[PDB]
Design a protein around this nucleic acid. Structure first.
Ligand SMILES: [Mg+2]
Ligand SMILES: [Mg+2]
Lengths: 94, 301, 267, 94, 300, 267
DNA sequence: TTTTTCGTAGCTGAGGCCCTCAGCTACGTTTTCTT
DNA sequence: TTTTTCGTAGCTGAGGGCCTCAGCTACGTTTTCTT
């Protein structure tokens, strides 16, 4: 089991509550919890299935280089970028 | 537009939360506690094995439904923290499990093997040769009084026996009652999650929580009662909260939620018999059971 | 045996009695002694005191859909009576007792005795035939285009209208039948004909009475061809359950079915 | 070293960049990283010192009951609440 | 209104990041890489021990200042990945450390003790009794050729010696890039510990002498085997994959965590304590602020 | 030690030469052979090619504030020349060499020779006396109310205006002095009078020339009593550094100080 | 006796918070070390 | 020879994205198990 963070934007109330089933919402659209791998994947399929027009990013603790990994769904001005294996965030121009 | 809601394994959950002072509703499909002033408090219901409803709570239909769908046991408790009522999915999801338990319970010799295993797990050694179940119960009575005396002397708490009033006793009895209540909560949760009936027991019988009493009695003095004595000696004004915190800590440190289902499975396994296969004359399952991320006893999709 | 359905209001305790309360004041007085079972329909809210009283007198609370067309949660989960569950289980575990129960189910289902002692698989065949015949008969009586029973357990929308209706009706029926089984104090998972499902016994009992009422109405509504078929079938089933005391007469049937084991019932 | 999440709102650009020194910003005001205890305390005094009129919540992975802990600075409609030692979030009315 | 910015320990950091194709600026006090189209990419500079600037990058004054203040080493590399230049805080923050190193380096017998320790750590056993530094360096030459041959046959890569033109074959290109990464983090570590990269014991009289010493201690334990692995994989563009491989080998063998203790141990073999301030000296008028970072980096 | 200060533009390479580029085109041609050291003032941006060239010819890049009133980063960190650092260190490590150096420093402070051979701590006493005396002298020459040297190393805003001015001036001076020390190729941390501070040697050298220019300017500005004293002092120090070649004349002084060890310099 | 009453989801428009940026001005600075 | 040129922080008003809610309508439902 490892720490999980889900950040949603412009997402239906359905998904907001659905995430609130397992995770603690500390700010609007920002959910925190602690889950196993398999549960994390199920939550991800929930997000992919219910996000609709919205966009979501999910980050979780690992024993990798940076201590965590993250993946996204939908379009956002801030999008992940690869630098020789290190994943950072690119901020696109308007 | 819609995706099913399912339970997650019990080992992956927080043991319990106590809710008091408010109405419990569902908002956007989430379990929520609302007080008189309008303050909302979301409760990650799926991430909890057991929800304790104290006096002054009022639960909506939708909330009970939701709690059942994610396989979270709702437990209504009175003051001094005793279990009063419970709500959850109507029953076990697997026929073979329930028939396994019942077959074990109905046959005296199998029953005896199971009880003997319970005794071995509880005390740390084999029960004496050729004893009936009631004689084992006698041995257990003796050892239990010895254990109460021992804890009473280790923590230095005056002990005049187990005593309670139905609406009280000394601090230590109140503490024991609340702690034991928490244990029965998570144990009933575990028994239901594993897919068995809380009513069908081996040592205790003919009671609505017989199996709960059996399994809980196996680890009670390993877990909740010492902590009850610790808190008793601390002499607090209102024991129940301190007992709740202490029980959560002891459950977490000794990995109770992780070991409860294997404990049950092992106990029953001591009968040396396999869960009965479906009769060959039976009608085949027309629609296959959906694969589940949760425990075997909870319903899915 | 007695039970009451409560709807739209809060269940509280006044003077040691169960009370249903709305904005207009006390809506329903329920003396504690008069009910073994309380069915909470949607729009209900349970006070702690009500639950406490229910525990004190050992009353079963069951959270249900309307008219019991859906069962969602139950108090006393797993069943509150050892003797009932063990009665059912003993019946299911013993080859010949089970055999008697199955034979009774098939006879009630065919209406008067099943053949001397044809085997069980053969009875399943004969009734498969009977069921197809019944589908055809209802199809001609209600005059509905029928190309057989066909449905996709993963996509609700690809069968024809009549199959949707049939599915929704049977769904509701499974609801009230589960309600009745819980009220009787038995486990829905432990069946005699059906096994290996959370509701095997529910299917066993439901298949007995399936064709008397709700499947015909599935056909009726199918011919009416409304905008929202499944919903109209659900509502119609609700009405049928309310008017014809379905849940109330389901319990004697269950008890009879089990009684066919020629083993003695509890209290 | 453990996983860290910082969520800022209505906070000066000074603090935004300052956090960007150590943490990865995956959404506006949402920073993720992996730090030791002492560094986390330092970041916290940076937040307490630079947040001004804004409000911040910081959550980090632990070996506690829920797998993580969190603390806040400044006023927010969503505020932490204690239930027998379990810390949840209360959402205050307008 | 303002709070100081300080370095964090090297062990707590990611080893390195390679930046290319863009201008590096400061926005709201943060290190940022901006490309031709306006795409911003924030780089957690404080969380990184070493930043590699590839061709086509242009670094602002503010950015260099910022990188120094959080004690992140900037390293300009050419392609084939070779280190070219470096930038960081002007020097060690502790007098006694530098005087310790210099005293060790200046005295032959102390120098010899340090070199002998280096040899023991590198090869896994004591150097033979009664040897000068040049004779130890001879022994090291022999063993090094032996190691190249051994790796060449274990990974099955054709080996015709260490060769490059200021071009070489794949294994040599890989070795050059990997070694470059190692020199990066090692220089970072040496500066963080508070020592001078120019003052070495085995290699001397070169701007990165001490870097060569320390790096040579762990080089064949770490970066060169990985160079051979990649060499046998035979990629189009060796350098990126060498980078990934080096990052992985650094994290797995906890290099950043062990580099400063390794240095401290190496010097400690001199059996001497870092010199105390002279009693005639002027007392420190304003006390050094306590730091969360390493001893060699400046604070507040 | 030839050097150039570059400001407001990008440093690139054209035809193997260092070039400073604006919107207006090439602003400054720098032949690679003519500079040992390039000081980058605020508003500069360094191209990769420039750095590569600087490495090829071994040119020191130093990121500085204006006129060198602040030092922020240095290429070749820790120093690029072993022999320089070892010269300095050997001087610092040996008791008698160190003593020769300290005595030379004090003689430069006093004008010409400190007393023949009475101890160092005692010289520090004399220098304290003389420093306070100088504060008083400047205070009376420029007519500034003087209640002694007072400042709070943690709160800049507590002392009087003149103390702020003095502190800011000495700050700038520490800037250019560090610049000069880096240009000479020595370590700022290794001092002879001051020790145990990252800039001990900087303090050593700076205290020699502190009172000739910038402290008097601190007093002048103090009496002018402007809105922003510290800023006016910084700008004034910048101007003084540019007009009077302070950094250029600092290096011979340093080399002289060290030369007093009567040990021979490198190349 | 003619008792529509409760809890929750979907939808939409109003209000408001706050992120993002263009455009303008001011700046090269967060210091002190023989108090 | 009269060459103000570059990079970055603070400020403010405009634009806009999205969270939050009041107020209204519709609803009790996410099913099938002898195909
Ligand atoms: Mg007992
Ligand atoms: Mg070598």
């Amino acid at each position: 089991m490892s720490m999980l963070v889900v950040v949603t934007e412009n997402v239906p109330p359905r998904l907001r509550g659905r995430l609130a089933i397992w995770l603690l919402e500390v700010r609007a659209g920002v959910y925190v919890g602690d889950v196993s791998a398999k549960i994390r994947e199920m939550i991800w399929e929930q997000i992919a299935g219910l996000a609709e027009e919205g966009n979501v990013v999910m980050a979780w603790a690992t024993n990798t280089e940076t201590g965590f990994e993250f993946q996204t769904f939908g379009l956002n001005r801030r999008t992940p970028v690869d630098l020789d294996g290190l994943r950072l965030v690119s901020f696109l121009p308007v | 537009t819609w995706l099913p809601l399912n339970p997650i394994p019990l080992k992956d959950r927080v043991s319990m939360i106590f809710l008091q002072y408010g109405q419990i509703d569902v908002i956007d499909g989430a379990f929520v506690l609302i007080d008189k002033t309008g303050i909302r408090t979301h409760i990650p219901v799926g991430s909890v094995a057991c929800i304790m409803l104290e006096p002054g709570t009022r639960v909506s239909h939708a909330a009970v439904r939701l709690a059942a769908q994610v396989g979270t046991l709702l437990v209504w408790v009175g003051e001094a923290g005793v279990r009063v009522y419970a709500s959850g999915q109507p029953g076990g999801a697997r026929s073979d499990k329930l028939l396994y338990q019942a077959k074990l319970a109905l046959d005296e010799d199998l029953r005896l093997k199971v009880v003997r295993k319970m005794f071995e797990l509880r005390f740390g050694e084999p029960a004496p040769a050729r004893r009936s179940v009631e004689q084992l119960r006698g041995i257990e009575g003796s050892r239990v009084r010895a254990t109460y005396a021992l804890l009473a002397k280790q923590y230095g708490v005056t002990w005049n026996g187990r005593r309670y009033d139905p609406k009280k006793g000394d601090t230590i009895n109140q503490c024991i009652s609340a702690a034991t209540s928490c244990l029965y909560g998570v144990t009933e949760a575990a028994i239901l999650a594993a897919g068995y009936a809380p009513a069908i027991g081996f040592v205790h019988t003919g009671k609505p929580l017989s199996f709960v009493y059996d399994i809980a009695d196996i680890i009670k003095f390993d877990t909740v009662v010492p902590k009850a004595f610790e808190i008793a000696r601390r002499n607090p004004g209102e024991p129940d909260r301190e007992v709740r915190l202490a029980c959560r800590d002891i459950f977490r440190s000794s990995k109770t939620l992780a070991k409860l289902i294997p404990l049950i499975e092992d106990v029953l396994a001591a009968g040396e018999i396999q869960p009965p296969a479906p009769p060959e004359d039976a009608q085949p399952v027309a629609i296959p059971l959906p694969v589940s991320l949760g425990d075997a006893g909870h319903r899915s999709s």
